Amino acid sequence: VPGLLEDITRTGLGSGLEFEEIKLLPEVAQQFYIELPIQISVVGGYHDLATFVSGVSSLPRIVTLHDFEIKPVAPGSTSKLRMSILAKTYRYNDKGLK
């Protein structure tokens, strides 16, 4: 199954947004599942950022979102925002924690 990075790009997510950083982190084993985290920083207006969050939220797969941060990039009038978020997908763990 294609990863979250591909889902964003295959379905065309993030219109109007300027990606700054995409970092795929090492998988984290837990006793019931393996987490696949992706850290993303992206710049845009509130509307385009919201559309992106809704797009990820509407994917037909379990994605959890964490560590949401948003700050204006500059003190100017109505300027764009920098949004940081950690997204995770999951797969089963049938092998324990050895």
Numbering used by the authors: 109 to 206
Q: What did the article's authors report about this structure?
A:
Type IV pili (T4P) are long, thin (5–8 nm diameter) hair-like appendages which extend from the bacterial surface and promote attachment, cell-cell aggregation, biofilm formation, and twitching motility. The T4aP system in P. aeruginosa is composed of four subcomplexes that together form a transenvelope machinery. PilMNOP are critical for function of the T4aP system. PilN and PilO also form heterodimers. They are predicted to have similar topologies, with short cytoplasmic N-termini preceding single transmembrane segments (TMS), followed by periplasmic segments consisting of a coiled-coiled domain linked to a core domain containing two ferredoxin-like αββ motifs.
Although the soluble, stable complex was used for the crystallization experiments, the resulting crystals contained only a truncated form of PilO (PilOΔ109). Although the PilO construct used encompassed residues 52–208, we could model only residues 110–206. PilOΔ109 has two αββ motifs composed of α1-β1β2-β3 and α2-β4β5-β6. The four β-strands form an antiparallel β-sheet onto which the two α-helices pack. Previously, only one discontinuous β-strand was identified in the first αββ motif, but the new structure exhibits another β-strand break in the second αββ motif at the same position, resulting in a secondary structure pattern of α1-β1β2-β3 and α2-β4β5-β6. The main chain carbonyls of D175 and F176 do not participate in hydrogen bonding between the β4β5- and β6-strands in the PilOΔ109 structure, creating the discontinuous β-strand. In the new structure, a dimethyl-Lys residue (K196) was identified on the back face of the β6-strand, the result of the reductive methylation used to promote crystallization of the PilNΔ44/PilOΔ51/PilPΔ18 complex. The monomer orientation in the PilOΔ109 dimer places the β-sheets on the same side, forming a longer 8-stranded anti-parallel β-sheet. Instead, it is more likely that the previously observed PilOΔ68 dimer interface – in which both N- and C-termini are oriented in the same direction, towards the inner membrane – is the biologically relevant one, similar to the orientation described in a recent cryoelectron tomographic model of the T4aP system of M. xanthus. Only PilO R169D and I170A reduced twitching motility (approx. 40% and 50% relative to wild-type, respectively) and levels of surface piliation.
